[model samples]
Target chain A: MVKVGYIQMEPKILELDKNYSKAEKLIKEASKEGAKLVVLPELFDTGYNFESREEVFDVAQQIPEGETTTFLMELARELGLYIVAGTAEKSGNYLYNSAVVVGPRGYIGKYRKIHLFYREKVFFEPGDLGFKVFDIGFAKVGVMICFDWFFPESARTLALKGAEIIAHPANLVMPYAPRAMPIRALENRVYTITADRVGEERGLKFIGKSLIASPKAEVLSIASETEEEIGVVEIDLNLARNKRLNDMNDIFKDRREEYYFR
Target chain B: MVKVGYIQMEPKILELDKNYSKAEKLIKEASKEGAKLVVLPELFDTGYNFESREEVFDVAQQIPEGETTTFLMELARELGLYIVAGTAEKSGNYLYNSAVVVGPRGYIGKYRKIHLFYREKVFFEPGDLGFKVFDIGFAKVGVMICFDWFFPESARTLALKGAEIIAHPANLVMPYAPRAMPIRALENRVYTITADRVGEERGLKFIGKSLIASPKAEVLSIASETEEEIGVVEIDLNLARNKRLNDMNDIFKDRREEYYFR
Candidate 1:
């Protein structure tokens, strides 16, 4: 059994120091509560709703060397845990909405958000890093951001790559993702943890409702729609290994691949 | 506006005449209620859970020429409506779990179940025909059986092929589909109607909860889990045509296929 935790906090727009401090505190608390794997909301450092590409670039930072990434890496090492956090990444004049995976050992990897939502396309280039899953010892974990949840392929791709748990970081304003994530978990037979922010940014409300769901789509833990809370659930990694739904059906083996990919 | 209706009824095992009669009665009632398009549950004629392949063949017959298909064709013409109904199909010693589409004009098309559920693998052949969408005058509709709902590719393929609505016929025992169907509708920006059965057959209990969802994933109408009823909802066909979710995002256009089909 592994303890999974997610933080739901309202980040003040452009308030990097305050947001990072709060996130750091939350991760410490979750670690204290025995959470080995913790998740933070999308763009936890800078917040969402940028007016222009220049505005995004002003806040987006370089990976690993960036303050947010360095702090996360150090915190994971200090806490002896793993973390998946969302950030706006800048690399060679191109911006990508991305999530970084860090563990006690160091930075594991990053997944650039594949499906961009609304005005995001104007500021960020579509992800080119491709879908990836990291071996975090206790389980194989995959990362995706807010709008990526809208595409079923995001989770399916991660599951196909041997991910047992999908860590989703989001500043969700939409009502569908929380309800839909469970289906993704059930379909792929993987554990899913969605960490969404609460409160409003520039009159744009962010629905919290962070959740952790089991392979059967059962809710292990969930936060309120509008609350600053830490949602944690203990789950067996083995629950995701057995994809056999019944006597004659194995979820992965039953896919009619020949008819798909058209 | 198109009045989409779906019938939810429990079929008695091996009782073809009773099942056909009940389905016919439900279709007539829905037509009387001004429903122009109607759907019936999976294997509505021959109940699900056959003892063997021979048992399935005993009730399964030729498509379009069979008593069940003929009855639906005549009913659609008589009522001046479009019908999507599921059945067990037999052709040269091969049995296929399929759903047939018939309109006021004549038989439109059929979709063989691509993803077979438990025990179905023993008897039915996987679908040979690719995903199909029918131009039903009022709306372009697609059909998928119960198990097909587990695979997002089933609905995604249909939506990509220009289907405005999906007609789902299910004998669902699991609890995931009812909740997951809305996400399918939301992601594809299409209306969806799910017709599910509501009783026990050979100790296997089927969950009813038949529903009709809007392009935005809102439930227009839904039936209870243990009732015989017809769910009817009036939806504008135009709601599905404009896949543009916002000023900058079109649901279908925003798909990152390069990141997916890999």
Candidate 2:
């Protein structure tokens, strides 16, 4: 069984220094509780609800060299654990809302948010890097951000690419994601860790409801909608690799690709 | 607003005549309550949990000329309503678990079970005809059987084909579909009516929990797990046609086809 930690905390909008310090403290706390894998909410350091591209650019930083990534790399190495966190990424002049995956060694890879939510379109460019699954010794991990959950294919593509655990980071202001996520886990036969933020930012009330769901569509552990807490759950990776529904039915084997492709 | 009716009742195994009679009575009850569209549980005429292919073929009939389809056609014409009802079908030597769509005009289309469940593999052949959406003047409707809901693409394909409402007929033994279906409606921006049967047959207990979910993933109406009842919900078709989540995002238009198609 692998213990996974999800940090559900509030982020002060555009307050980089304060937000980074708090998230770093939470990472250390989760590591002390024996969490092998820990995830933080989307835009953990730079909060959402930006009014313009200039506001986003002011906070965006490079992937491997970014202050958030560098801090997480050191933290992961110190704890000997894997960390997945979201931040605004800058490359040349363009900016993308992205998540960085780090392990004890260093930064593993990054996943840009492909499906940008409502107001995000005004600030960030859509993700260019295709879907990715990183093999982290124990299990294959994938990443997708808040609005990506709106599309079922986002998880399916990762599962097809041999992802056993999907780490989701979010600043969810709506009610759909928490309820719909279990189905994504069930359909893909994968464990999902949805780390959502709590409290309000610029009048947008972020629904906390951080969760860990199993392949059977069961919610392992869930946080309340308005609380700042860390929810952790232990899951066996074996269940995720086995996608058989019954003796004669395997989830992936039964799909009618001919019909579905059209 | 269009009133959609969902019939949640029990079906006795191999009792085709009795099941047909009972389902016919329920359709009339829903029509009296002002339901313009009525949907019955999967295999309404011939119950699930068949012992052999011979058992399935013993009850299976031809599509338009079949007793079940002919009855539904007449019922639709008489009640001046659209009906989606599941049945066992025999075409040549092959047997298919299918749902027929009929309206006041006549028989509209048929959707075979593309993704058959466990024991069904031993009896019925998988569907050959691709996903279809039928325009009935008031709304465009699509049909999918029990296990098809397990695959997200089933609903996505229909939604892409212009289906505003999906009529689902199920013999749900598990708790997944009732919860997952609302997400299907929410993601596709369509109305969904899931008609599931109640009671046990051959030690396999079918959970009722029939529900009608709106485009926003709201449970409009739901039936009890063990009770025989009709769930009716009125929905404005206008909400489904408008796929815009915001000024910059159209649900279908915003899809990352470049990344998804692979």
Candidate 3:
């Protein structure tokens, strides 16, 4: 069993310092509640608005070598838990929407999202590669940023390659599309938890319908679209493995690659 | 505009001599009717009974040095038409349930059924390789045998790589599993035709909904299952291309390989 938390925080545009401090408080509160894994909304440290980038720029950290990641890594180690958080990444000449998983051992993993959503393409470059899973002691966990959800192959590939739980962090805007999560979970038989924000910033209303889905493609929990929501739930890893291996093997087993190559 | 003749014929289980004479009669009639391309039911010289191999070993021919193929090439040249017919092919120590297409110019292509149904695995080895496409005048034609229809990737690979039409020389036994055809046509957005024997023989019910489907995934033409029947339909290649490029692009464009890769 894995105790997971999905944090739906309302971050003001261009308010990195303020957002980070608030998110930090939430993380501490979630950790105190004995949550094994915590997922934060996309761009939680820096709000998802081009108008907000300038103010958030001051807080953007160099990933792998930044103080933001270091702070989270130490916090996770101290709390003896795993944390999945969205961070603004500053590399040499490019900025990326990245997700980091900090575990008790150290940094569990990191993923730079490959597919960019409509306006996100205007702000962040598309992640050009595939995702990989890592052993989080009890089960294997996978990570991909938002907009990555639109690609069925991304989730299918990860589930086929053995991901028990996949974390999705998104700063979603309105015209909510609820089809992808359940479709992917049912198709791949892997648990998925999405963390999204619910307030408006810079004229865009974030429709927070953050969800947690079972491997059977059932939505286990859903966040409200109009409020600040926080919740913790336990997912059975053994059930996910059994459901995938016995009932849904056709999803992965029926692939005929040789014919596909032609 | 390519003229494809879907030959829906019911051949006896142990009567090779009669089946060949019937094939000759149909070929002549189809040619006179202006069929530039003609395809027949799977295992037309013998019924599609997996156990019939032992009873009809006299009908199975050696690959490349087979009388059925030689006769098909000669008939194709004489009629100035292209022919695709199913026959039992013996390759080295094993026998393959196969089909070969003889072009007007010469003997052109062949394919072994990849996925065998029920007891077929006991009599034939699976085609472990990929699907193959053929050049027929200005069109690209892909061929897959009966059981391969159940797998989406079997047809998807061919269509993804620009196969204009995928043909199945099938001996279907019904009430057909039924769900596969429309799903396959919709997923690939390519013209597909599956021809089956219409008459029952040896207590086996031969289901002949020998069908030709449009690119929009609807059955354009169909033959009856109870008796010998012919359903003629005109396929507009340009319309198929237009639908596939415009409306069906969503099927391909929506794949998220990154999420699935893990």
Candidate 4:
């Protein structure tokens, strides 16, 4: 069983100092709880305040240059835990809403939100990055950001390549989002953990129901909608491996994907 | 609110008399239960006996001319109900597993199972026919059969063409099938009634979890495992309509089909 936790946090808009302290507190809590993996919500440093993109442009920092990354990496290394979190990044002239995963060594992987929502297109540049896969001990893990969950190809490509667990860090608002996140977990049959933000930052109702689900499409645990709560669930990676083997058998013996792909 | 019921059944191996009687009984029950729209399981007249190709070859009949269609048409006219069923059909020498929807007026529309399963390729020819969206009462119903559910393209195509309710009649035998059905309902935000067969006639276990799911992917009602159950569920197709009209605002509208088509 892989111990995973999601921090359904309440982030303050533009308050980087406060957000950093809150995130650090949660990471320390998860570490104390013996979680192997923990994820924080999207745009953890600056919150989902893209409405004031130009004003907060200075706040977006490069990975190596950023204090948030350095601080999180040190925390991850010290705790001996796999930490995944979302932050806004400044790359030359462009700004991208990104998620970074700090592994046992340091920062191992990152995924920029490929599909941006309505207001996001005006504020941030779209990510050109394809789905990325990495090895975590014996199991393979994949990463994707907020809006990317809407499309199946992103997750499908990750699973097809080799991803036992998919981690998504999101700050999705509105009612429709919760439905999409869980369906993604079930359809791909890989354990998925979605970390979402709770409470309203700027009058937008952030529907916070952070969830951890197994490959068999079972919801192990969900963050409480009414309050800010940490949700943790253990998923058997062996079961995910077994599912892949079973699906591969049917594909090997029966599928005609090449003909369709052609 | 057009009451639609998708019947989950497993017809016997060349046991036409028993299968036909069973279907007739279900039809009567559905009408009595106020099912304005009903769908029968795939190949209820014959069976998914692809292993016994010779038996299927002998028993399969032409559309509208065969005993199964004739009896069902008469039943629909008598009961003032619309009927849809997936069955094995013989057109000249080539046989195909097809779905036929007969209204109280007569035959309304048909969708030949576009994608055939394993061994079905050997038993029947690939269908060249596309899907249809029909105006049934207040809702527009889309008809598809068997292997079509594996690809979202078919479902998306129906959704693109303004189909509200997706009626899927499948004959499958897999353990993980129950989890996959509800995703179709949620992803499309359309009411999906998937009717599957149960019990193995010839070394195959047909997964029989006939489900009626809401646009939110809520399983309102479901038939249990490996049993002969004439399932019924009352869904307000208007709920699908409302979700599509109000909540769906630009959600499904921005489907970048052209980019994904290739």
Top candidate on lDDT is: 2
| Sequence-dependent TM-score of model 4 | 0.79
lDDT of 3 at A155: 67
Write candidate 2's Cα lDDT for A72-179 as tens digits: 899899899998888999888998999999999998999999999988888888998978888888989989999899999999999988999999999998888989
- At residue B51, what lDDT does model 2 achieve? 80
Give the lowest summed-lDDT range of ten residues in model 4 chain B. B253-262
Q: Give the 10-residue window scoring lowest on summed lDDT in candidate 2 chain A.
A: A253-262
Relative to the true interface, what fraction of contacts does candidate 3 keep? 0.37
Instruction: Output the lDDT of residue B59, model 4.
Output: 86
What would the per-residue lDDT of candidate 4 be over residues A124-179, giving only the tens digit for each residue?
87775667777767578888877666656566566666787888888877465565
Candidate 3 to native Cα RMSD, angstroms: 7.9
**If both were scored by TM-score, which would come out higher, candidate 2 or candidate 4?**
2
lDDT per residue (tens digit) for residues A1-262 in model 1: 9899898888877888899899988888898899999999998888898877898798888897888899899999999999999998989899989999999989888888888888888988888888888999989998888888888888998999899999999989878888898899999999999999998777898888999989999988889988888977889888898899988899998888777745
- lDDT by residue for model 1 (B38-135), tens: 99999998999888888888879788888878889999999999999989999888999999999888888898999888888899998889788999
- Across residues B34-144, which tens digit of lDDT does each residue of candidate 2 receive? 999999999988899888889889878899998999999999999999999889999999999899999999999999999999888888888889778888889999888
Per model, how many backbone clashes are there? 0, 0, 15, 2
lDDT order of candidates, best first? Answer: 2, 1, 4, 3
CAPRI quality band, candidate 1: medium
Give me the TM-scores for chain A across all models, comma-separated. 0.98, 0.98, 0.89, 0.92
Candidate 3 DockQ, CA atoms = 0.19
Give the Å error, residue B29, model 3.
Answer: 24
TM-score of 1: 0.97
- On lDDT, the stronger of 1 and 2 is 2
What's the TM-score of each model vs. the native?
A: 0.97, 0.98, 0.58, 0.79
DockQ, per-model, please?
0.71, 0.73, 0.19, 0.18
The worst-scoring run of ten residues by lDDT in candidate 1 chain A lies at A253-262
> Candidate 1 chain B, which ten residues in sequence have the lowest lDDT sum?
B253-262
